[PDB]
């Protein structure tokens, strides 16, 4: 099975909303060693976001039922752990591809910031369902991946680049939900918004993507300050 045929089946799977099939196709494309193109890198990101997202949504529901209810309590607990496993298996697959193929092959600063942001993303997803001594190590792994990607983007990217703005959006989300630091979250999002606004006076062809992330940066700022 050649790479160009795996990619086509992955694009067909995205149209059919068959995201488990999409991730399996992009996983085999990545495991061939060749550096991912811009399209293939997006296909892999979209595939695993939907795959991990379905279990994330399922987890928050069964976890809330387990908390908000004896015999029925157990079944909510046991079912939540089954989803929790699935969730952990998906993240470990992504972080294995990033550690073994994606990050080592990233020769451009744009690709490095992308894969390093995604590494902090899936360590954050693990932290959402983590508890105890294990949780502390995962959270630190997520903050180190975000903080790294933050500093190549600050030195190699313009303030209006969608990858830099998207990383600042997820990094600030990490600070609010994972570290429980609303001040560091609001400061990070407000700085990225204003630096991009200041640069807007002096970007092209990425109009739609950057302005959408700028709105999400201000949306999160509005909601977080309301929790004074």
């Amino acid at each position: 099975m050649d790479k160009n045929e795996l990619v086509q089946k992955a694009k067909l799977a995205e149209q059919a909303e068959r995201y488990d099939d999409m991730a399996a196709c992009m996983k085999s494309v990545t495991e061939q060693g060749a550096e991912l193109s811009n399209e293939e890198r997006n296909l892999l990101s979209v595939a695993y976001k939907n795959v991990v997202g379905a279990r994330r949504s399922s987890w928050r529901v069964v976890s809330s039922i387990e908390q908000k209810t004896e015999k029925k309590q157990q079944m909510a607990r046991e079912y939540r752990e089954k989803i929790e496993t699935e969730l952990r298996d998906i993240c470990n697959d992504v972080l294995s591809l990033l550690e073994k193929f994606l990050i080592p092959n990233a020769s451009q600063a744009e690709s490095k910031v992308f894969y390093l942001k995604m590494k902090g993303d899936y360590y954050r997803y693990l932290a959402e369902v983590a508890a105890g001594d294990d949780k502390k190590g995962i959270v630190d792994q997520s903050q180190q991946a975000y903080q790294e990607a933050f500093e190549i983007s600050k030195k190699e990217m313009q303030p209006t680049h969608p990858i830099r703005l998207g990383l600042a959006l997820n990094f600030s989300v990490f600070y609010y939900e994972i570290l429980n630091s609303p001040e560091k979250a609001c400061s990070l999002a407000k700085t990225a918004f204003d630096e991009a606004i200041a640069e807007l006076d002096t970007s092209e062809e990425s109009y739609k993507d950057s302005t959408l992330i700028m709105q999400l940066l201000r949306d999160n700022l509005t909601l977080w300050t309301s929790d004074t």
């Binding site: 990101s45 976001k49 959006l169 989300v173 993507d209 992330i213 949306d219 909601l223």
Partner: peptide, 6 residues
């Protein structure tokens, strides 16, 4: 509140 796929 994180980044969507667009």
């Amino acid at each position: 509140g994180s980044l969507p796929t667009f």
